[PDB]
Amino acid sequence: NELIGQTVRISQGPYKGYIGVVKDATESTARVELHSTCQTISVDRQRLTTVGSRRPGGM
Amino acid sequence: LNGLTDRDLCELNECPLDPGGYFIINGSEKVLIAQEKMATNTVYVFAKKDSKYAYTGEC
Amino acid sequence: MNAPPAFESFLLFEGEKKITINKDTKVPNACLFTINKEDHTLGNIIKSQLLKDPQVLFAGYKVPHPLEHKIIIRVQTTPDYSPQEAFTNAITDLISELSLLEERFRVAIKDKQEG
Amino acid sequence: QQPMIYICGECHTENEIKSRDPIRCRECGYRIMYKKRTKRLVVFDAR
Amino acid sequence: ESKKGFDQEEVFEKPTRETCQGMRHAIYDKLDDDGLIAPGVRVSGDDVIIGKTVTLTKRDCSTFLRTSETGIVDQVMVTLNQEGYKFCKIRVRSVRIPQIGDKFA
Amino acid sequence: PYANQPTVRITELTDENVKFIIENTDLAVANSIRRVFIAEVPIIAIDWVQIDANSSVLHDEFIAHRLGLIPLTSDDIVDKLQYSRDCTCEEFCPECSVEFTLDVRCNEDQTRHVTSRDLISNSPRVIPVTSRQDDILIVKLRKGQELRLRAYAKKGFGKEHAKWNPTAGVAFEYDPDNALRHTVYPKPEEWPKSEYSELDEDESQAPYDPNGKPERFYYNVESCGSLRPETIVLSALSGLKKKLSDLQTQLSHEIQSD
Amino acid sequence: EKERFRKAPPNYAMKKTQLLKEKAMAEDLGDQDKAKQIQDQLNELEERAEALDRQRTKNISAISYINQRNR
Amino acid sequence: MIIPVRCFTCGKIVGNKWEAYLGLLQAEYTEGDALDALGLKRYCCRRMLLAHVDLIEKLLNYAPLE
RNA sequence: UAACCGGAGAGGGAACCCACU
Ligand SMILES: [Zn+2]
Ligand SMILES: [Zn+2]
Ligand SMILES: [Zn+2]
Numbered sequence: 001n002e003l004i005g006q007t008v009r010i011s012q013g014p015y016k017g018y019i020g021v022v023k024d025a026t027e028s029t030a031r032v033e034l035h036s037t038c039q040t041i042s043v044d045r046q047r048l049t050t051v052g053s054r055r056p057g058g059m
Numbered sequence: 060l061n062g063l064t065d066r067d068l069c070e071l072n073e074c075p076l077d078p079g080g081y082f083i084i085n086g087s088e089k090v091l092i093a094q095e096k097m098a099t100n101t102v103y104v105f106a107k108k109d110s111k112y113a114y115t116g117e118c
Numbered sequence: 119m120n121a122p123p124a125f126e127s128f129l130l131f132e133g134e135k136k137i138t139i140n141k142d143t144k145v146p147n148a149c150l151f152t153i154n155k156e157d158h159t160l161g162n163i164i165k166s167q168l169l170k171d172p173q174v175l176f177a178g179y180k181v182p183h184p185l186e187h188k189i190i191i192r193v194q195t196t197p198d199y200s201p202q203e204a205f206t207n208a209i210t211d212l213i214s215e216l217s218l219l220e221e222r223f224r225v226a227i228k229d230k231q232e233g
Numbered sequence: 234q235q236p237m238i239y240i241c242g243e244c245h246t247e248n249e250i251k252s253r254d255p256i257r258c259r260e261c262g263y264r265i266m267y268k269k270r271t272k273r274l275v276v277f278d279a280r
Numbered sequence: 281e282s283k284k285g286f287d288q289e290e291v292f293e294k295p296t297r298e299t300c301q302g303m304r305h306a307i308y309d310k311l312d313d314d315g316l317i318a319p320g321v322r323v324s325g326d327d328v329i330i331g332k333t334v335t336l337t338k339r340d341c342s343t344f345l346r347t348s349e350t351g352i353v354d355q356v357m358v359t360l361n362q363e364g365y366k367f368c369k370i371r372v373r374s375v376r377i378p379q380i381g382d383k384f385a
Numbered sequence: 386p387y388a389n390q391p392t393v394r395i396t397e398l399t400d401e402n403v404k405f406i407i408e409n410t411d412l413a414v415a416n417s418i419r420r421v422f423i424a425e426v427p428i429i430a431i432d433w434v435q436i437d438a439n440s441s442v443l444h445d446e447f448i449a450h451r452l453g454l455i456p457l458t459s460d461d462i463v464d465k466l467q468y469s470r471d472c473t474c475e476e477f478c479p480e481c482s483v484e485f486t487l488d489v490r491c492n493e494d495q496t497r498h499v500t501s502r503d504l505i506s507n508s509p510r511v512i513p514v515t516s517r518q519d520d521i522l523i524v525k526l527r528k529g530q531e532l533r534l535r536a537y538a539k540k541g542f543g544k545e546h547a548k549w550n551p552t553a554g555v556a557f558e559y560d561p562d563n564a565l566r567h568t569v570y571p572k573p574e575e576w577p578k579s580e581y582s583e584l585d586e587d588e589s590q591a592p593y594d595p596n597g598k599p600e601r602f603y604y605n606v607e608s609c610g611s612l613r614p615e616t617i618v619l620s621a622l623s624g625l626k627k628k629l630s631d632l633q634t635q636l637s638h639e640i641q642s643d
Numbered sequence: 644e645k646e647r648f649r650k651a652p653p654n655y656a657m658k659k660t661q662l663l664k665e666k667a668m669a670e671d672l673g674d675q676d677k678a679k680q681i682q683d684q685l686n687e688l689e690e691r692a693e694a695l696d697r698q699r700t701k702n703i704s705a706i707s708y709i710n711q712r713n714r
Numbered sequence: 715m716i717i718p719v720r721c722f723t724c725g726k727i728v729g730n731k732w733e734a735y736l737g738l739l740q741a742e743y744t745e746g747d748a749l750d751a752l753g754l755k756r757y758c759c760r761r762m763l764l765a766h767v768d769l770i771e772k773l774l775n776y777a778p779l780e
Numbered sequence: 781u782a783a784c785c786g787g788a789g790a791g792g793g794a795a796c797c798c799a800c801u
Binding site for chain 8: 500521522525550
Binding site: 004005020021023033035038 | 307309310322324350351374375
């Protein structure tokens with residue numbers, strides 16, 4: 001879809017400040033596989049904020 | 060790795076506590092399990108009662 | 119992988135009530151308070167405070183499962199006293215006593231420190 | 234324009250390996266060699 | 281990776297939903313263009329570890345993490361084997377807090 | 386039908402432990418304070434670690450775990466911060482967190498003790514306990530190995546994780562001589578005397594006292610450095626009193642709405 | 644071409660060069676190559692042992708002294 | 715592998731005592747008199763330092779570079 | 781007096797040692 005496969009950061013609610021990669025997103029929720037714990041939780045898609053992981057200067 | 064001191068076992072990325080005694084065959088450590096058997100060259104008088112024989116001097 | 123997150127013992131979900139009163143039907147004047155996201159810390163002081171009330175005929179608390187964070191407090195009083203006000207008065211004075219214990223611990227500190 | 238950099242075993246020198254290359258170190262000659270850490274976001278819960 | 285036959289050959293390569301025909305429902309961009317996941321990358325069950333294609337256009341032939349295994353990639357090494365083929369070993373680590381059901385003697 | 390009037394008597398107060406005696410209270414109130422010392426007293430502890438380069442021999446999570454267990458002096462901050470989950474911000478704030486930073490590279494020839502001296506805070510008041518006695522070893526690096534990370538400390542209590550547990554050990558005790566026979570010794574003389582036993586060396590246990598309740602609960606609260614041992618107490622009394630006030634508000638809403 | 648002006652005991656080639664120098668000494672029936680190899684090997688052993696004690700100069704040196712004395 | 719930060723049972727910080735305790739044993743203290751000169755009373759906290767085996771000193775022998 | 785896209789369960793067999801209740 002659109003944000004499936006991107007690194008997000010949960011920014012509200014009980015998992016605040018927790019990083020993971022989105023596995024499956026729908027119009028409302030998303031399944032984030034958390035980076036520290038060994039678990040995939042299902043968070044609301046508005047509690048998320050994309051963080052991205054890129055490199056500049058490519059030369 | 061023989062008669063080799065302890066800095067050098069560690070310089071080759073090894074442990075000085077490894078006992079040895081095993082083979083590497085296609086990158087697997089294999090051990091040869093010791094198999095027992097009967098002593099050869101020795102006379103043993105048994106008695107099988109489940110046959111036609113009273114006694115038997117194997118060798 | 120089936121481990122519950124540890125904030126689940128004190129954080130209330132969405133829709134859960136803290137406390138929930140249910141009239142009990144077997145005996146007259148008995149209620150059941152069901153506190154969510156609590157344990158023996160809060161359930162034991164209230165019960166022992168309710169047993170000091172002379173108008174309380176039964177008080178107890180249980181924790182139905184330890185993997186779940188909920189206690190039940192069953193109170194039965196005498197007919198001129200609802201268990202709604204037994205449970206309220208058992209908290210008001212438990213508060214008044216903890217506040218007084220705090221004042222006294224504080225003056226005993228500042229007298230021990232140089233005194 | 235990232236050439237897939239490896240670290241040698243015995244040398245500890247970064248090499249550039251593109252595809253269709255022999256895996257050997259640019260010096261000393263070593264056939265074992267490892268990859269570098271990721272650049273993504275590693276965040277742990279000190280937990 | 282190997283020489284399977286005249287027309288058949290394996291190679292470490294990110295598959296693409298364009299040429300690799302057999303291909304999984306997975307996230308292939310976790311692995312970088314070398315076709316190998318890099319150390320420090322969180323994985324889970326049936327995430328692609330070593331991207332691999334075998335030519336027929338290309339079939340997908342890649343290796344995946346064992347279902348419900350869930351680690352972080354520890355280190356990746358690349359080398360050649362006696363036949364002189366590229367050969368890699370990835371190891372994946374997984375921290376295990378003592379939860380209930382675990383056996384203690 | 387009413388409250389009791391407890392009295393307190395501090396017998397020893399150092400900067401590492403307090404011994405007090407509480408009299409005239411119920412056993413349930415005295416034990417529930419003991420539990421509030423251990424779980425519900427807020428404290429600052431590292432809880433978010435972003436590792437930029439780790440080449441030590443320890444893991445990535447082994448470092449982060451050993452960093453969460455480093456006690457940070459929370460003493461007047463901890464009551465001004467907010468919980469992270471309640472800060473109306475995005476990505477930690479100075480008003481709900483404290484930021485740390487470790488950057489170490491071993492260049493010399495000897496091994497490097499990465500200790501908690503290297504954790505540099507951005508607030509001068511929340512520091513690891515180094516103020517006024519060695520430091521908590523985090524790793525040991527060799528020549529060429531390094532560690533850069535930044536970490537964040539937020540507020541929490543020992544009911545979520547033990548890292549937010551402000552005490553070394555709470556020593557509760559009541560009735561030192563078996564006056565209530567709450568415990569029943571099969572041979573009462575093989576038992577050593579309590580520290581608080583007002584008993585001679587002749588007799589073994591106090592004679593049975595039939596009508597009698599516990600009072601005089603003896604406590605010995607020992608801090609781990611993070612809060613001062615009399616602030617653990619004053620905070621457990623306020624934390625308990627606040628659990629009760631919140632329960633009472635939710636109760637009055639349940640009552641009026643039925 | 645890189646090994647030519649680059650020294651062989653720098654850095655991790657130390658042990659491998661030690662065994663290979665012993666192999667080069669053993670492969671030779673000429674006494675001159677054996678004595679040159681013995682001198683090079685003793686010099687490399689001393690340099691490596693000095694480098695090894697300097698790194699173990701701190702905090703491993705301290706636990707060796709405690710174990711030696713605890714037994 | 716490396717000294718735990720806290721005593722598992724108690725909560726007390728024992729992470730800063732491994733060097734001090736190996737230094738006292740190097741001095742001359744007996745092992746039981748070193749453990750209370752450091753201030754470890756409960757036997758819960760005392761087994762952290764007696765039983766600890768330090769492996770990171772052996773793991774540091776495997777240098778990545780130099 | 782106007783407005784660009786549509787494809788989906790894939791997939792594997794034989795033999796041997798170790799271990800668990
Ligand atoms: Zn090479
Ligand atoms: Zn904030
Ligand atoms: Zn302890």
